[PDB]
């Protein structure tokens, strides 16, 4: 439709590269930093820039697990983009749950695997998983 | 209420009353409540590990046919409460510096010189 388009700042580009170049490496993107910079928006802008169907999965809340497990099937098939806003905000229990899943999809996705064995489902190449968050501690993610 | 962290105590009882049959249960697995009623009536030693989380359902027993419960604690600093302290007979087993020094002096004399042990043993 009309949607929203960010401003291609010198950062938006240096970020656009890290993701594309890294997304081409069959690996999900993870932009950290102090909340309020573009971590999410930029990621959404990239997908909307490639005619993709990016999805913002709001964490730091009641993040349903029984729902997430499902939705992933859609991302893998439709070939949509899964963006976890503040992905580090998930309770250790749930955070460990999803993490384990993304591990499954992303790992098998780096081998070209036409179909993942999550939860065997079809794995589309254009599909992509993105996890935003705050900077770690002293450089560590 | 054996406050034994080194585990030596627990090891002692399980070998002392192995005849009377002992159950190494604990306030953990549900098997507990089931084991007690068994040991209680049918008579036979017990042993409830981790007494840090004891239920107020045992009280009636800890205050009175032919058995004996053994409350244990691996926490050498376990800060108990008044109620539990009163209805129980503490038995500390934490190995202090002096104590352990004694255990080695013996377990060494009984080996690095068993002869001089048969003398004190047999004689006395």
């Amino acid at each position: 439709g009309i949607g929203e388009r960010l401003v291609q700042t010198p950062l938006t580009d240096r970020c656009y590269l890290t993701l594309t170049q890294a997304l081409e490496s069959r690996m999900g993107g993870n932009p950290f930093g102090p909340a309020g910079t573009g971590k999410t928006e930029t990621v959404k802008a990239l997908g909307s820039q490639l005619g993709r169907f990016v999805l913002v999965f709001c964490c730091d809340e009641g993040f349903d697990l029984q729902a997430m497990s499902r939705i992933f099937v859609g991302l893998c098939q439709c070939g949509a983009w899964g963006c976890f806003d503040e992905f580090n905000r998930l309770e250790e229990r749930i955070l460990s749950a999803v993490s384990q899943q993304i591990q499954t999809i992303q790992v098998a996705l780096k081998e070209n695997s036409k179909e993942v064995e999550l939860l065997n489902i079809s794995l589309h190449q254009d599909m992509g998983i993105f996890v935003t968050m705050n900077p770690g501690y002293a450089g560590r993610s | 209420l054996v406050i034994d962290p080194s585990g030596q105590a627990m090891e002692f009882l399980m070998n002392q009353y192995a005849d009377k049959k002992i159950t190494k249960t604990s306030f953990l697995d549900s098997s507990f409540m089931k084991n007690l009623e068994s040991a209680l009536r049918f008579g036979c030693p017990l042993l409830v590990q981790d007494v840090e989380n004891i239920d107020p359902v045992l009280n009636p027993v800890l205050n009175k046919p032919s058995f004996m419960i053994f409350l244990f604690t691996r926490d050498p600093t376990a800060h108990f409460t008044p109620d539990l302290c009163s209805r129980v007979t503490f038995v500390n087993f934490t190995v202090t510096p002096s104590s352990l020094q004694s255990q080695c002096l013996h377990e060494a004399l009984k080996t690095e010189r068993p002869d001089t042990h048969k003398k004190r043993s047999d004689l006395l």
Binding site: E4, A35, G36, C58, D60, E61, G62, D64 | -
Partner: protein
Amino acid sequence: SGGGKTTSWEVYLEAIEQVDNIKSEAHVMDPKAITKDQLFGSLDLTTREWTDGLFTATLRRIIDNVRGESTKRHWIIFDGDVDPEWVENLNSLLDDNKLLTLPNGERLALPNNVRVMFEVQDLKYATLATISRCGMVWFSEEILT
């Protein structure tokens, strides 16, 4: 407290219905008088049964011209305490978003004839994430000598 707040927006809304003739209906409610799950709703983890919330519904009656609410301007003032709690479920509405989505994927859009506000005494318990996408209007008590 007692600075002219509750009175200010009361004269403003009442006066706009003449310079525009359009009715400026408002909806006040203490966001702390009820449990958060009643201010936005929740999901029954036994049948996916969704129990509507106060704000969720009050925003619906407007999108659904049951009584013809679109025929006028609206106002949803949260006359209550503010914390980084019942405010986060609105982020995706206070900014460009404009959609108080719900766990059941209801996705409630926000018209242009509807405005949300707050009448808090303080924000000492508010984070830079609560206000951020909000209009700050200091109401010093010194105003009402």
